[PDB]
Amino acid sequence: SVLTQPPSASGAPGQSVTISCSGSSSNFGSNHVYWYQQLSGKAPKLLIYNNNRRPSGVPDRFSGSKSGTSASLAISGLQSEDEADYYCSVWDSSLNNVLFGGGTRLT
Amino acid sequence: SVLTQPPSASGAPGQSVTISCSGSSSNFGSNHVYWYQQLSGKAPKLLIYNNNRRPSGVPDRFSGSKSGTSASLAISGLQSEDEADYYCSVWDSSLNNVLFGGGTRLT
Amino acid sequence: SVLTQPPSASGAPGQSVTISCSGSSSNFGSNHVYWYQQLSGKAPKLLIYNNNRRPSGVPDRFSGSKSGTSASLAISGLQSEDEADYYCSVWDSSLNNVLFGGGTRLT
Amino acid sequence: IEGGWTGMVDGWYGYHHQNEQGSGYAADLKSTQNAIDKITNKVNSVIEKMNTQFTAVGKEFNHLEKRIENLNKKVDDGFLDIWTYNAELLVLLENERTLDYHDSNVKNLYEKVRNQLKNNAKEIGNGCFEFYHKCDNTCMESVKNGTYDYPKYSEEAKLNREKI
Amino acid sequence: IEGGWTGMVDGWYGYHHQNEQGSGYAADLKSTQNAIDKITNKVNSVIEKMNTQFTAVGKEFNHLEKRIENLNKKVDDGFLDIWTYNAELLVLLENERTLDYHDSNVKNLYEKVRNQLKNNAKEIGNGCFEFYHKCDNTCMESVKNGTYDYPKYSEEAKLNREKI
Amino acid sequence: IEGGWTGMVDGWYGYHHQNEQGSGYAADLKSTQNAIDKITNKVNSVIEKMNTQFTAVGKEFNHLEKRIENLNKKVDDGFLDIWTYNAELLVLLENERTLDYHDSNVKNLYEKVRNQLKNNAKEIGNGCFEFYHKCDNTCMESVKNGTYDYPKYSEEAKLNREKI
Amino acid sequence: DCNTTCQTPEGAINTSLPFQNIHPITIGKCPKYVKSTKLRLATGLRNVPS
Amino acid sequence: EVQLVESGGGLAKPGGSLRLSCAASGFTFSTYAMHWVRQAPGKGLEWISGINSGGGSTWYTASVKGRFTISRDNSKSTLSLQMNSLRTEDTAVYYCAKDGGNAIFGLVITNYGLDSWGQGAVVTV
Amino acid sequence: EVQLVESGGGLAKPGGSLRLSCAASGFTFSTYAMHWVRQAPGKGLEWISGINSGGGSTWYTASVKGRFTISRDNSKSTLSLQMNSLRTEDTAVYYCAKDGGNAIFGLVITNYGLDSWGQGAVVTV
Amino acid sequence: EVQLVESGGGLAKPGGSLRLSCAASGFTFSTYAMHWVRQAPGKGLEWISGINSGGGSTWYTASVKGRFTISRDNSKSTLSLQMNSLRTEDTAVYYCAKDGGNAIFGLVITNYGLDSWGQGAVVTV
Amino acid sequence: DTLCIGYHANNSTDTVDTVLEKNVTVTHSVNLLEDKHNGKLCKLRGVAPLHLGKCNIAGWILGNPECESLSTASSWSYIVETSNSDNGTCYPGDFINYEELREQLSSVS
Ligand SMILES: *[C@@H]1O[C@H](CO)[C@@H](O[C@@H]2O[C@H](CO)[C@@H](O)[C@H](O)[C@H]2NC(C)=O)[C@H](O)[C@H]1NC(C)=O
Ligand SMILES: *[C@@H]1O[C@H](CO)[C@@H](O)[C@H](O)[C@H]1NC(C)=O
Ligand SMILES: *[C@@H]1O[C@H](CO)[C@@H](O)[C@H](O)[C@H]1NC(C)=O
Ligand SMILES: *[C@@H]1O[C@H](CO)[C@@H](O)[C@H](O)[C@H]1NC(C)=O
Ligand SMILES: *[C@@H]1O[C@H](CO)[C@@H](O)[C@H](O)[C@H]1NC(C)=O
Ligand SMILES: *[C@@H]1O[C@H](CO)[C@@H](O)[C@H](O)[C@H]1NC(C)=O
Ligand SMILES: *[C@@H]1O[C@H](CO)[C@@H](O)[C@H](O)[C@H]1NC(C)=O
Ligand SMILES: *[C@@H]1O[C@H](CO)[C@@H](O)[C@H](O)[C@H]1NC(C)=O
């Protein structure tokens, strides 16, 4: 299985942006998904946990959902500091591996 | 085991007649008994089911009972059409066979 | 394991006397104890049963108790007939044997 | 004993035989009869033990006597809650016990067969048995009935097993 | 383990030994003691959990107050039905569980013996064991206590078994 | 399976492996997940089935109406006794069944492993297995997953076993 | 014109089952009222496809 | 109303072989056991043989063991009775009948007996 | 009141053999265990040996193992104690006694102890 | 706040061997699984390998099987990743991270994912 | 010569609930809950119940003129009224101990 993401995303400040994650139906539906945020030259930090929750220190403006085989990450109140890379992570039991996407650039 | 029946039975029209069936105590008591009626040159039809009941289409005048090792079939409202042969059927597990009587003639 | 008892006991008539029985902590605590009375040249008779009770025919003046690893037998209303030998009996599972004491003389 | 059988409609538990004389399914009379009797007795005990009396649930009251009406409502609600909780727990426990009993019956039949043979049938692991010695309809009937004779076919089974 | 034993009156579970030094029955101390303790605890738990309070069941009422009398009768009938149903179900379940527990204890003792020997005793199928090697009173006591040593008599058992 | 394991904190049931490539503990995913789901469903069923309604327990009465107060006290005491007895019995039965279910799961896992190998591992009697043939990490993973191939290592196991 | 043992206001109930969820108000030797909507005892085997 | 069709009668020399065919309609043939019962001309009935609803259980009497064979096909809902080593005593009228089924929790328990009979096929030797 | 009869005493030379017999009446001999306890002349008691109610369990002390044998017959309600390789230390008074039984759900659990004693048989070497 | 220290980076010639060390503090190292994840310079993330909380379960991808070895010590709360047969593709930044634990009746169920990351060690070939 | 041990199965889709799992398919199930009613008021104890849809117990026993057409029964098991029981006491007033009289008249031998 492979994970596909849009090459980049754009959005004016103060608006909302959406990032889509897709994968094989066999493993994506059964398992869960995670959305990670990585800054420029900084250690990535987890954003989306258990497809519905977020870790401590994550602002409530971020939201996540999973419908069918497609996961959606919504960002509201876009700021200058919010400009960072975003990654989608799933688990596959057929290959028993953690699969990460190619990354998305927000601007 | 063997089954014994009276060679024949007699009765005036409109009266009631009784037919007796006997067998070995080992198998007759544990299992059930059946009374069948066969016409002259016709296919036999079941009359007594589960020692207490009768199939559909059997008039309520017929009755059956089983006391000890002896089964009794009672016929009331005797008619001309009721003149037919009657057979007693049991099951034996020691020989694993269905045992039928010699037949009774009603007149 | 071994059982130790005082060599003899003394007491004025009408008073109360105490007899002590001791043994190994491993077996004495888990199992029960028995106190027996034997006359001069007579068959011994059981006095203390289940550490709290007494058989029929034993006067209520006798009492028994078991604290820690020490058993105590108390005799009240001492009489001339009460002058007899007393024995302590325990059971050991490590050696699987019934252990008796050296006997106590009351006077 | 992984998948079920749709070819057996004369008994909850039974065997499937196949030899040069044919093939088919045959329910075990004794075990099925005992299971049916026990299940019927369980159902009859559950239904019958509900003792019923000629009662009149529901009492009308005046507006002034609202306290008695509230007491009656509380009693009715308590009875309803007790009955619902007890019935739900009883149903769950009975279903679990019945499923466990059926599994135990299947395991007991398998163990009985294996104890009866103990060398004569190679085990495949799916509950089936492969007879080393030649078995006819009489042999299958003897095995199912429980009167199988070990030394009668032990020599043949050993001879067939030592071939490989 | 088909028929019961009338010669053992010192324990629910036990063994029967017979060798050149005599014969008899001997109850297993540990298993019987554990079973007795568990059954006693079950009985004490069943009896003790019935919390009782100083109450006065039965209230007299006037002819005019027939509604309150009917309410009291309904409450009493509901309590009686609930108690009867619960007690019957509890008794049936406890009896079934106790019988299953006794059967499980017997099976566990048999499995423990077989696991302890595993080659030394030929199995007859009725729960009995036939020792290939010569066994004395000490061997029987060691087997019953659970401290049987496999390699001490394994060679003798193998030598006796290979004779046939 | 005598003493517990403190080195496994990722599953109620699991295995311990040790070979030339290392050592450690690994919980079985399928069995642990099924047990967790069943226990969670049991807890949810026990908690949820308690149907609750908006009620007001406790009614005040005048001094003259002492009969109604006594009736209310009797009803409350009966409800309290029924609830206490039922809750105690339910808790005891559920705890016993859960312990028996855990023991059955452990026994089933052991039986599954033994059925999968049946010749390849010498049994020590404490629940451990000693592989006659050389086993690597892949072999351990195959055994734990349940996809172990008998004929692949049967020859090696037989050769190693016949050495002694 | 009929004869029955239990008479619920919605309609007559002629049965022998111990539980009913039609209406709490009942007259006669009626089954106990239960708030649940599904009470089934599993008597057969666990049905699985094959 | 169930329907039973019987065929295969005729004249066969002693020591030969014969085949009887029974077809059923109006009911599920795979959920009810079957029986073949003979009747001598001018004499009483005589149960001969039977087969279970799911097959796998063939019941024969002492006088027919090793001589008669029963084979049923549920897909075609057909029953075949093969007779070998025929004798003069075999001359009789044979009937193919279904068995009684007790409905116990959706299960059909076979009860030894005959509910509906066929028509009758005459076999003469 | 239970009754116990003891017999078999006398004088035996060192290195010989002796037999003691105990008979019981007034109670079921097959439901209560038995004990033989010796007492030295002028000294204290000393438990010697015992046998279970249902037999099959003989308990001996370290000083009597391989020397004393116990055999009970429930049909005759008799107990036999056989002593071999007698020594001068064996001179004592022996007592045959019954054990205590705890009634637990109709079961008689043996409790290590003596309820009723016998009479005493003197053995001198 | 958990603390992770990563060490062992540097320059290694192709075909050589390398060792990476990860130390954890602020949490029980024996109750949480660990993962090593690499990131190419200027590219996306790439999960490499992982080990269970109690050890005994090492997970590797198809590109690292037979090449990387994981060894954890709970007493020292240390993790060692040994790389053999290095290639030019191995040049990347590696991160040592802990896993997520679901609390189910006091049991920590491992969930595939990373909660807190380390710092990053650069390996160049 | 192959022998296998199995268990009965069919096309039944009945669902039962267990304490360990839910919606498990079984071959057969027995219903203990009655959700079907005849929808008609039958007779209890073989005695015809009294129908007073157009009147009321107060209007019946007091002989209300609108209840003259109602027939008098020798015995009944229970009393049935309806929502449109507007014909009770035509003359306004208070019926003291009305509830007790209503209760006592439910069943008369
Ligand atoms: C019996 O009940 C009926 C219906 O309730 C009463 O009918 C009244 O009819 C008049 C005109 O026909 C309406 O204005 C009233 O509104 C009706 N009553 C009601 C309650 O709606 C009838 O009067 C009643 N008879 C007696 C004697 O009480
Ligand atoms: C079949 O079993 C029954 C009892 O289970 C027995 O009476 C009968 O003799 C057996 N039949 C044969 C042929 O062994
Ligand atoms: C009998 O078993 C107990 C514990 O079960 C043990 O302490 C004792 O040593 C054993 N006796 C012998 C002779 O092995
Ligand atoms: C592990 O088991 C699963 C199902 O239990 C199976 O799909 C998978 O192929 C197995 N893996 C291996 C390597 O056999
Ligand atoms: C009422 O139910 C009983 C069984 O409880 C049944 O025998 C009877 O026929 C039923 N009556 C009607 C009218 O359905
Ligand atoms: C199973 O098939 C039979 C065939 O007639 C049908 O009557 C029955 O309704 C089916 N079962 C279910 C649960 O639909
Ligand atoms: C079981 O089926 C019912 C039917 O609607 C459904 O509401 C319920 O969620 C199901 N439960 C599970 C655990 O699937
Ligand atoms: C009630 O009706 C049923 C069926 O019509 C009848 O069997 C019964 O005898 C009747 N009861 C009385 C008391 O007439």
SS3 track for J51-108? ECCCECCEEECCCCCCCEEEEEECCCCEEEEEEECCCHHHCEEEEEEECEEEEECCEE
**For chain E, what percentages of helix, strand and coil (3-state, to nearest 5) are there?**
55, 10, 30
**How do H34-39 and H92-98 pair as beta strands?**
antiparallel
Query: Which amino acid, A53?
Result: R
Q: Does E104 touch chain I (CB under 8 A)?
A: no
Helix axes F66-117, F29-48, angle to 10 degrees: 170
D40/H104 touch (CB, cutoff 8 Å), yes or no: yes
**How far, in Å, CA of J45 to CA of J27, rounded?**
25
Contacts of J94 (CB under 8 A, 6+ apart): J6, J9, J20, J36, J37, J38, J39, J48, J81, J120, J121, J123
* E68: chain D residues, CB-CB within 8 Å: 68
Distance (Å) from the C-alpha of residue E65 to the closest C-alpha of chain K?
Answer: 8
| F125: Cα within 13 Å, side-chain hemisphere | 9
* I33: chain E residues, CB-CB within 8 Å: 10
Say if residues K77 and E44 touch (Cβ distance below 8 Å).
no
CA E55 to chain centre: 38
Pick left, alpha or beta for residue B105 (phi over 0 → left; psi -120 to 50 → alpha; otherwise beta): beta
* Neighbour order of strands in the sheet with A63-67: A17-22, A70-75, A63-67
**How far, in Å, CA of H90 to CA of H86, rounded?**
7
Nearest to C33 by CA among C83, C70, C74, C84: C70
**Per-residue tokens: D128:** 């089936």
**Per-residue tokens: A54:** 């977020």
Distance (Å) from the C-alpha of residue E37 to the closest C-alpha of chain I?
Answer: 10
| Helical residues (DSSP H) of chain C, grouped into ranges | 25-28
D147 lines ligand 2 (CB under 6 A): yes
Regarding chains C and F, contact by 3 or more CB pairs under 8 A is answered as no
Contacts of J79 (CB under 8 A, 6+ apart): J21, J22, J23, J24, J34, J51, J70, J71, J72, J73, J96
**Per-residue tokens: E116:** 């302890």
Which ligand neighbours the alpha carbon of E145 most closely? 3
Say if residues F31 and F38 touch (Cβ distance below 8 Å).
no
**How far, in Å, CA of E140 to CA of C73, rounded?**
40
Which ligand neighbours the alpha carbon of F38 most closely? 7
* J71: chain F residues, CB-CB within 8 Å: 22
Distance (Å) from the C-alpha of residue I74 to the closest C-alpha of chain E?
Answer: 10
Record the resolution, in angstroms.
4.1
F75/D78 touch (CB, cutoff 8 Å), yes or no: yes
Nearest to D131 by CA among D22, D21, D17: D17
**Per-residue tokens: B24:** 């070995």
**How far, in Å, CA of H6 to CA of H24, rounded?**
9
* D45: chain E residues, CB-CB within 8 Å: 88, 92
**How far, in Å, CA of A62 to CA of J90, rounded?**
34
> Nearest 5 degrees, angle CA F110-CA F111-CA F116?
100
Which DSSP category does G3 fall into? B
Query: Which chain F residue is nearest to residue K22, measuring alpha carbons?
Result: F41
Say if residues B91 and H112 touch (Cβ distance below 8 Å).
yes
H/E segment holding residue I36? strand I34-39
K12 lines ligand 6 (CB under 6 A): yes
Sign, CA torsion A76/A79/A82/A84: positive
K87 lines ligand 1 (CB under 6 A): yes
**How do J78-84 and E121-123 pair as beta strands?**
unpaired
List the residue whose alpha carbon is closest to atom 17 of ligand 1.
K86
Q: Ligand 1: distance of its center to the CA of K90 in Å? A: 10
**How far, in Å, CA of B103 to CA of B88, rounded?**
7
Subunits adjacent to chain K (3 or more Cβ pairs under 8 Å): D, E, F, G, H
Nearest to F15 by CA among H116, I12, A9, F23: F23
Q: Scan for tokens 């310079």, then name that residue.
A: J41
Query: Which chain F residue is nearest to residue E48, measuring alpha carbons?
Result: F85
Q: Does G37 touch chain D (CB under 8 A)?
A: no
List the residue whose alpha carbon is closest to atom 9 of ligand 8.
K46
Which ligand neighbours the alpha carbon of F29 most closely? 4
* K29: chain G residues, CB-CB within 8 Å: 40-44
Question: Phi/psi at E142 (nearest 5 deg)?
Answer: -65, -40
Residue A90 forms beta bridges with which residues?
A33, A99
Q: Scan for tokens 């075949």, then name that residue.
A: H80
Question: Phi/psi at C106 (nearest 5 deg)?
Answer: -105, 130
H/E segment holding residue E74? helix E66-117
Say if residues E114 and I35 touch (Cβ distance below 8 Å).
no
Contacts of J10 (CB under 8 A, 6+ apart): J18, J123, J124
Burial class (CB in 10 A: 0-12, 13-18, 19+), A28: buried
| C-alpha distance across the termini of chain B, in Å | 29
**How far, in Å, CA of F108 to CA of F114, rounded?**
10
Which DSSP category does I90 fall into? G
**How far, in Å, CA of H103 to CA of H115, rounded?**
15
Ligand 3 test: best mutation among E137, E145, E150, most atoms within 8 Å of CB? E145
CA distances from I62 to B105, C31, C98, E137, F31 (A): 89, 21, 12, 15, 53
**Secondary structure class of F121 (helix, strand, coil):** strand
Which DSSP category does I3 fall into? E
Question: Phi/psi at A84 (nearest 5 deg)?
Answer: -160, 175
Ligand 8 atom with the smallest distance to the CA of K43 is 1
**Long-range residue pairs from D72-78, CB within 8 A, at least 24 positions apart, any chain:** D72/E71, D74/F55, D74/F56, D74/F57, D74/F75, D75/E71, D75/E74, D75/E75, D75/E78, D75/F75, D76/G24, D77/F53, D77/F55, D78/F75, D78/F79
**Long-range residue pairs from E143-148, CB within 8 A, at least 24 positions apart, any chain:** E143/E113, E143/E116, E143/E117, E144/E15, E144/E17, E144/E26, E144/E28, E146/E112, E146/E116, E148/E116, E148/E117
Nearest to D141 by CA among D8, D13, D15: D15
